[PDB]
């Protein structure tokens, strides 16, 4: 008993101890700002410090969707630059005297986020878990994506300074010790947004790891992955990312700039390497593409004829007011369009395309990109977003025309879609070019609510196989039949009624233009199929089943950004534990 009592205590002081840690990634995306609360198992060992078991990372709460950072900033500018700064020269050096107020406005948003996080923590964690989490500190990574990637002047980066200071002064009452630093909390580039999502996917599907289960050191000392790493396509609110690893030794054109995971510090040296193509396209997100598509379609003569715009991507029988404003499908089957500029889906693009944004004012090529998409930078905002000579939009439900319009407008435009200097510098102007220049046998996973709803809808109505493998022509068929549907108002509201007595489903604010996304998918799969190499397969997924069976977390870039930091164990240990929250004193 005594002889054990001693060895018990001896084991204790000689081995590693496990402890739970909270990690918060706040997604400052285009559509909203929201928390994602993760738990992770940390291990501290004698003389070895502390690190995270990456396979233990799991989401435990996705937060409420609060105001995106654009709102905060434009609301700031309204007050302090004066109403309608979108249409006038505004001297930017003057807005430095309103820094404190930017802070104030940001404080309002952050208090909601903090409280929401805390709510998730309190509800999900038992008392014992709480002790460990409150003790270790809680790293917070707040990263802005496409919603503010295009934002002009110095405002965005000033905002991030203030955001970090706010994250680093959490309310002491709840006892969770949030903190951040300029590496964790920052704008992330399009390619990073891609790469992290790529990392997330392959982590969760256990394709990417360092151990013998997921790696082989080859005869020649190079660590390989045992299964092929998989590429990802993510269509968000404002942008879409395309990412895929290159089959090894692909000779690329000198202009195509691929990223090497080790070389570029995305993953530590002990992980397998790869050169991966990662490009993100502004205007290709659901909301962005929605507004741009309308502006371009309905200022083309083929579709606008004496006030009426015939839209091949909207159902026969559907019709709506002619603007890019947010569409509410009402119970009585009408479509209400919100004229409030903020809720107008052209607002981002129209704002970027101001003649008073130095990005246009001094760069003619950017002016040209605006004009090519029917935004005239010299006009005031209201005009810029107005669809000229157009009263109503009527749906003609013609999928193939929809496809070819998505093709020339969005996927293969004459000029690159505006605010895409990043994509272009990688060597890619358009989605078109990505698969013309680089291509890979790497299987591809398609992600994003929109994209998924597109396939699910066709599946639900038995127009696609349950076991749909990515065959383009099969998809074009299903979409062709589906998008032919007639819209019928009934007592139970507006109804999408399928051809050949094939059934029905309610029309609502989310599915009314879903055919566009079907066209986007078809277009994208066609370009893929045309590439020199073609992906071994294609799938659509929302989350990946964990070892348990249930998913540990969502697809996206959230897990990736955590992994990007925590995987560099010495650097992380230094920042997360040595400096930690105690730095804020």
Residue 452 CB contacts under 8 Å (≥ 6 apart), including other chains: 446, 540, 542
Residue 368 binding target from a copy of itself, Mg ion, ligand ANP, none, CB below 5 to 8 Å by type: a copy of itself
Q: How far is the CB of 285 from ligand ANP (least distance, A)?
A: 5
Show the binding pattern over residues 269-308: x = contacts a copy of itself (CB under 8 A), - = does not: ----------------------------------------
Instruction: Kindly report the backbone phi and psi dihedral angles of residue 448, in degrees, each rounded to the nearest multiple of 5, phi listed first.
Output: 125, 135
Asked if 29 interacts with Mg ion (CB under 5 A), we say: yes
Residue 554 binding target from ligand ANP, a copy of itself, Mg ion, none, CB below 5 to 8 Å by type: none
Q: E strand or H helix at 19, and its extent?
A: strand 17-28
Instruction: Kindly report the backbone phi and psi dihedral angles of residue 67, in degrees, each rounded to the nearest multiple of 5, phi listed first.
Output: -60, 130
Asked if 147 interacts with Mg ion (CB under 5 A), we say: no
Stretch binding ligand ANP (CB under 6 A), from 27-35, 316-324, 356-364, 405-413: 27-35
Asked if 358 interacts with a copy of itself (CB under 8 A), we say: yes
Stretch binding a copy of itself (CB under 8 A), from 431-439, 442-450, 518-526, 528-536: 431-439
Asked if 365 interacts with a copy of itself (CB under 8 A), we say: yes
Q: 301-304 long-range contacts, Cβ below 8 Å, gap at least 24?
A: 304/389, 304/390
Residue 361 binding target from a copy of itself, Mg ion, ligand ANP, none, CB below 5 to 8 Å by type: none
Integer Cα distance of 84 and 99 in angstroms: 20
Q: Any bridge partners for residue 307, and if so which?
A: 390
Q: What residues between 450 and 509 interact with ligand ANP by CB under 6 A?
A: 450, 453
Q: How far is the CB of 151 from ligand ANP (least distance, A)?
A: 12
Instruction: Kindly report the backbone phi and psi dihedral angles of residue 388, in degrees, each rounded to the nearest multiple of 5, phi listed first.
Output: -65, 145
Q: Which of 74, 114, 192, 193 is catalytic?
A: 193
Q: How far is the CB of 419 from ligand ANP (least distance, A)?
A: 12
Say whether 141 sits in a helix, a strand or coil. strand
Residue 493 binding target from Mg ion, ligand ANP, a copy of itself, none, CB below 5 to 8 Å by type: none
Nearest one of 278, 277, 284, 287 to 190, comparing CA atoms:
278
Cβ(482)–Cβ(463) below 8 Å: yes
Say whether 487 sits in a helix, a strand or coil. strand
Asked if 252 interacts with a copy of itself (CB under 8 A), we say: no
Asked if 415 interacts with a copy of itself (CB under 8 A), we say: yes
Instruction: Kindly report the backbone phi and psi dihedral angles of residue 551, in degrees, each rounded to the nearest multiple of 5, phi listed first.
Output: -65, 140
Select 397 or 427, whichever has its Cβ closest to a copy of itself: 427
Q: How far is the CB of 112 from a copy of itself (least distance, A)?
A: 34
Asked if 363 interacts with a copy of itself (CB under 8 A), we say: yes
Say whether 333 sits in a helix, a strand or coil. coil
Pairing mode of beta strands 138-144, 178-179? parallel
Active-site residue, 193 included:
yes
Q: How far is the CB of 278 from Mg ion (least distance, A)?
A: 14
Residue 287 binding target from ligand ANP, a copy of itself, Mg ion, none, CB below 5 to 8 Å by type: ligand ANP
Stretch binding a copy of itself (CB under 8 A), from 357-365, 463-471, 490-498, 546-554: 357-365
Cβ(326)–Cβ(337) below 8 Å: yes
Chain residue whose CB lies nearest Mg ion = 236
What dihedral angle (degrees, nearest 10) is formed by the CA atoms of 108, 112, 114, 115?
A: 130
Asked if 236 interacts with Mg ion (CB under 5 A), we say: yes
Q: Which residue in the block uniquely carries the two structure tokens 């190079």?
A: 222
Residue 491 CB contacts under 8 Å (≥ 6 apart), including other chains: none
Q: Any bridge partners for residue 444, and if so which?
A: 231, 538
Q: Which residue in the block uniquely carries the two structure tokens 């507004």?
A: 291
Q: How far is the CB of 568 from ligand ANP (least distance, A)?
A: 25
Rg (CA), the chain: 25
Which residues of the chain form contacts with ligand ANP (CB under 6 A)? 29-32, 145-147, 236-239, 285-287, 449-450, 453, 510
Q: Where in the sequence numbering do the catalytic residues fall?
A: 193
Which residues of the chain form contacts with Mg ion (CB under 5 A)? 29, 236
Which residues of the chain form contacts with a copy of itself (CB under 8 A)? 253, 255, 358-359, 362-365, 368, 414-416, 421-422, 424-425, 429, 432-433, 436-437
């Amino acid at each position: 008993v005594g002889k054990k009592h001693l060895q018990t205590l001896r084991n204790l002081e000689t081995r590693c101890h496990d402890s739970l840690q909270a990690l918060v990634v706040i997604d400052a995306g285009s559509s909203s700002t929201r928390t994602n609360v993760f738990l992770a198992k940390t291990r501290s060992c004698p003389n070895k410090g502390r690190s995270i078991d990456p396979d233990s990372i799991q989401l435990i709460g996705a937060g409420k969707r609060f105001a995106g950072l654009r709102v905060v900033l434009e609301e700031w500018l309204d007050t302090y630059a004066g109403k309608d700064w979108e249409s006038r020269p505004v001297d930017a050096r003057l807005l430095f005297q309103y820094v404190p107020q930017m802070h104030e406005g940001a404080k309002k948003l952050m208090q909601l986020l903090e409280e929401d996080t805390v709510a998730i923590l309190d509800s999900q964690l038992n008392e014992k878990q709480k002790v460990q989490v409150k003790a270790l500190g809680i790293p917070v990574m707040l990263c802005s994506t496409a919603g503010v990637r295009d934002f002009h002047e110095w405002y965005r980066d000033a905002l991030f300074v203030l955001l970090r200071h706010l994250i680093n002064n959490p309310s002491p009452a709840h006892g969770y010790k949030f903190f951040t630093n300029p590496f964790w909390t920052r704008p992330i580039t399009g390619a990073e947004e891609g790469l992290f999502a790529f990392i997330t996917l392959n982590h969760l599907s256990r394709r990417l790891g360092e151990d013998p289960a997921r790696s082989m050191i080859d005869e020649y000392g190079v660590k390989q992955s045992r299964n092929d790493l998989a590429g990802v396509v993510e269509v968000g609110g404002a942008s879409a990312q395309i990412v895929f690893p290159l089959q090894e030794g692909t000779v690329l054109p000198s202009s195509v700039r691929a990223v090497n995971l080790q070389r570029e510090r995305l993953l530590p040296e002990r992980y397998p390497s790869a050169d991966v193509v990662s490009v993100s396209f502004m205007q290709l997100g659901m909301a962005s593409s929605a507004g741009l598509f309308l502006k371009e379609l309905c200022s083309n003569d083929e579709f606008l004829q004496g006030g009426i715009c015939s839209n091949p991507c909207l159902f026969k029988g559907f019709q709506q007011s002619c603007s890019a404003g947010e569409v509410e499908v009402r119970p009585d089957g009408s479509a209400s369009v919100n004229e409030d500029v903020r809720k107008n889906r052209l607002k981002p693009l129209a704002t970027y395309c101001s003649v008073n944004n130095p990005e246009i004012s001094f760069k003619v090529t950017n002016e040209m990109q605006c004009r090519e998409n029917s935004i005239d930078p010299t006009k005031p905002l209201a005009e810029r977003m107005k669809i000229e000579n157009c009263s109503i939009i009527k749906g003609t439900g013609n999928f193939d025309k929809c496809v070819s319009q998505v093709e020339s407008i969005l996927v293969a435009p004459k000029l690159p879609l505006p605010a895409n200097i990043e994509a272009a510098s990688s060597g890619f102007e358009s989605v078109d070019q990505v698969f013309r220049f680089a291509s890979s046998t790497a299987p591809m996973i398609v992600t994003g609510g929109g994209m998924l709803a597109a396939i699910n809808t066709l599946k639900d109505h038995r127009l696609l196989r349950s076991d749909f493998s990515g065959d383009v022509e099969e998809l074009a068929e299903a979409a062709r039949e589906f998008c032919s549907s007639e819209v019928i108002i009934r007592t139970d509201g507006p109804v999408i009624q399928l051809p050949n007595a094939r059934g029905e489903q309610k029309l609502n604010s989310l599915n009314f233009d879903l055919c566009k996304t079907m066209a986007l998918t078809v277009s994208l799969l066609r370009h893929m199929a045309a590439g020199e190499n073609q992906p071994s397969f294609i799938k659509w997924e929302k989350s990946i089943a964990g070892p348990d069976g249930k998913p540990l977390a969502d697809l996206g870039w959230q897990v990736g950004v955590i992994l990007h930091h925590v995987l560099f164990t010495e650097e992380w240990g230094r920042n997360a534990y040595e400096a930690g929250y105690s730095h804020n004193l």
